[PDB]
């Protein structure tokens, strides 16, 4: 696994909010260590039988947390992100949708000399099945296993998880890097982690329209990733110049299209499927692994 495991101590920023409450309850039911949370003005209270703090400095001093998940509305995310980066927390997961691009440009540049990883924003988070979930993903569709997953989407990631759970392969760690133009963690950063994780025996890379991240990732894999990589690109059929829900999902000036991501996979020797239903099947074909749930 990478970054999160059964020892990870998790703080929740916006813990007392609707989504902070719901997803923290699901994380606790999954066996994730939710040590408490921060909501300015609710310091010294209890929520879900865990302490609430006014500040991340107080929360880290009290709990020794090493991870935080952000469920704060978009206008407060830059402030919440700098606060947690300054706190001593090593891993930050930002679920929030609608964060201004120029706020993430500043937060990403702020990270360059820090010992802190940021996943998101606009992402489902990170899960090491059987050990720790940080985010909104349904625990029960996952199973501890050997496939690492990197995706720019939420629900589409769940298709790749369901397919690998149903074939009995399972997942080592799954990272939803999110759909925004400047994520805190990009595909290459995540591919390096999975390459160096012994539990990960193969990698699924899920992308879509927008940017050159998949083309760049393909060039990285060709020379730096030895494990089998299976690609899938959503959005063959998207019209150009149209935001397809995700802020980062747009074809601008003949660039960010799907068939050139598929062409960069071919040039790098990276196997891919054109069917979202066949990610697990392509992985089985490439690896020659047994489907123990067939018989």
């Amino acid at each position: 696994s990478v970054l999160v495991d059964k020892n990870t101590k998790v703080l929740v920023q916006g813990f007392t909010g609707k989504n902070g409450t719901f997803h923290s309850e699901q994380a606790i039911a999954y066996g994730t260590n939710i040590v408490g949370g921060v909501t300015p003005g609710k310091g010294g209270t209890t929520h879900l039988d865990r302490p609430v703090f006014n500040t991340m400095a107080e929360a880290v001093a009290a709990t020794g947390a090493d991870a935080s998940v952000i469920y704060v509305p978009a206008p407060f995310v830059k402030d919440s992100a700098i606060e947690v980066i300054d706190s001593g927390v090593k891993l930050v997961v930002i679920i929030t949708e609608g964060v201004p691009t120029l706020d993430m440009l500043v937060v990403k540049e702020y990270l360059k000399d820090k010992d802190v990883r940021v996943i998101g924003p606009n992402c489902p988070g990170i899960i090491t099945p059987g050990e720790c979930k940080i985010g909104i993903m349904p625990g029960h569709i996952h199973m501890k296993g050997k496939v690492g997953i990197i995706s720019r989407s939420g629900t589409l990631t769940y298709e790749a998880v369901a397919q690998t759970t149903k074939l009995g392969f399972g997942q080592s760690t799954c990272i939803g890097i999110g759909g925004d133009p400047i994520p805190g963690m990009n595909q290459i950063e995540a591919l390096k982690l999975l390459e160096n994780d012994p539990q990960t025996e193969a990698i699924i890379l899920i992308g879509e329209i927008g940017g050159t991240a998949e083309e760049e990732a393909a060039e990285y894999i060709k020379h730096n990733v030895t494990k089998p990589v299976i690609g899938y690109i959503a959005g063959v059929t998207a019209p150009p110049g149209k935001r397809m829900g995700h802020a980062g999902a747009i074809i601008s000036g003949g660039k960010g299209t799907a068939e050139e991501k598929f062409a960069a996979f071919e040039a790098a020797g990276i196997a891919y499927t054109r069917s979202p239903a066949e990610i697990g099947k392509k992985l089985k074909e490439v690896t020659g692994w047994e489907n123990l749930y067939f018989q």
Partner: protein, 326 residues
């Protein structure tokens, strides 16, 4: 969010950029009065729509009188303009701009900026090859596209704008004027949360003046909550009506040209759903994100008509198959 030409010019003029000044006319009489107010021999009447290619579509006209301005404003206001950057129904013309003539222009330059996803930096692009398809220049002659990556701590520095000015062949006072233009554009970019801007052409007049003649400003819609005056520029008439209706219920709708509808949770899964239909012979009508295929998985979202969770379906492939077979 797109701005009108007149809005983009008022904004850039407030940052000290020199623009082809004009007056917005909401009827033909205001247009006539505008031609007189400018006090030029010639004016240029431009249909105010959010789409380029207005000139070739008949939406840009040189006029030489108040009555001629009234006439052109008459022919344009209230008729949808169809350009290569609209669809077959085009965009409503509720106003024209009446603009000063910048004739004669010596040179057309290009200047733009985006958030570059690869470098994660605000990046300017400039070229001597203005007033044309900048994509075609970039393809045929990439050495003619100058790029400047801006460091977020120090921002755009005069030396960076001077390096570009000398490479564009600018001379004497034009260098200083271009530096002011590029520094103003950067300040605007950050202070207004631009997603992109383009000045095409950035004209050099006979007398050496550097003037923004046309182009585009797109704002980051994620940031409009902190720019109430920019959010107030929104022109809902330029948006697709079906897209606009859906968005007011915070639903993401994009219309396509097919005959299968689909309802999905997640933008990635919505594209994958469309793609697995077109994989099974179907033509998607639409992208939709909360004959019709309903396809819900569920992360934050807690769980003829085909339903994959009335014809029921068991996996992704089943649903794509079933729904095209209908």
């Amino acid at each position: 969010m797109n701005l009108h030409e007149y809005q983009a010019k008022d904004l850039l003029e407030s940052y000290g950029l020199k623009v082809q000044k004009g007056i917005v006319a909401h009827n033909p009489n205001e247009a006539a009065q505008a031609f007189d107010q400018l006090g030029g021999k010639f004016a240029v009447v431009k249909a105010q729509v959010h789409a380029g290619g207005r000139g070739k579509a008949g939406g840009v006209k040189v006029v030489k009188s108040s009555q001629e301005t009234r006439e052109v404003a008459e022919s344009l206001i209230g008729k949808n303009l169809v350009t290569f950057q609209t669809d077959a129904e085009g965009q409503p013309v509720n106003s024209v701009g009446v603009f000063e003539d910048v004739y004669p222009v010596t040179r057309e330059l290009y200047l733009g900026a985006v958030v570059d996803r690869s470098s994660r930096k605000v990046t300017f692009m400039a070229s001597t090859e203005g007033g044309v398809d900048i994509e075609e220049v970039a393809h045929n002659s990439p050495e003619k596209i100058l790029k400047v990556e801006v460091d977020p701590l120090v921002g755009l520095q005069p030396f960076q704008a001077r390096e570009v000015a000398f490479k564009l062949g600018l001379e004497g006072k034009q260098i200083n004027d271009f530096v002011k233009t590029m520094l103003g554009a950067y300040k605007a970019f950050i202070e207004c949360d631009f997603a992109l801007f383009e000045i095409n052409p950035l004209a050099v007049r006979e007398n050496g003046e550097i003037v923004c003649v046309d182009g585009k400003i797109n704002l980051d819609s994620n940031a409009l909550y902190r720019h109430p005056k920019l959010l107030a520029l929104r022109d809902k008439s330029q948006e697709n009506a079906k897209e606009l209706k859906a968005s007011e219920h915070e639903l993401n709708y994009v219309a396509l040209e097919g005959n299968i509808g689909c309802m999905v949770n997640g933008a990635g899964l919505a594209m994958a759903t469309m793609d697995i239909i077109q994989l099974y012979g179907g033509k998607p009508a639409n992208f939709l994100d909360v004959a019709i295929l309903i396809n819900i998985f569920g992360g934050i979202v807690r769980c003829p008509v085909v339903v994959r969770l009335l014809i029921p379906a068991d996996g992704l492939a089943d649903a794509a198959d079933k729904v095209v077979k209908s």
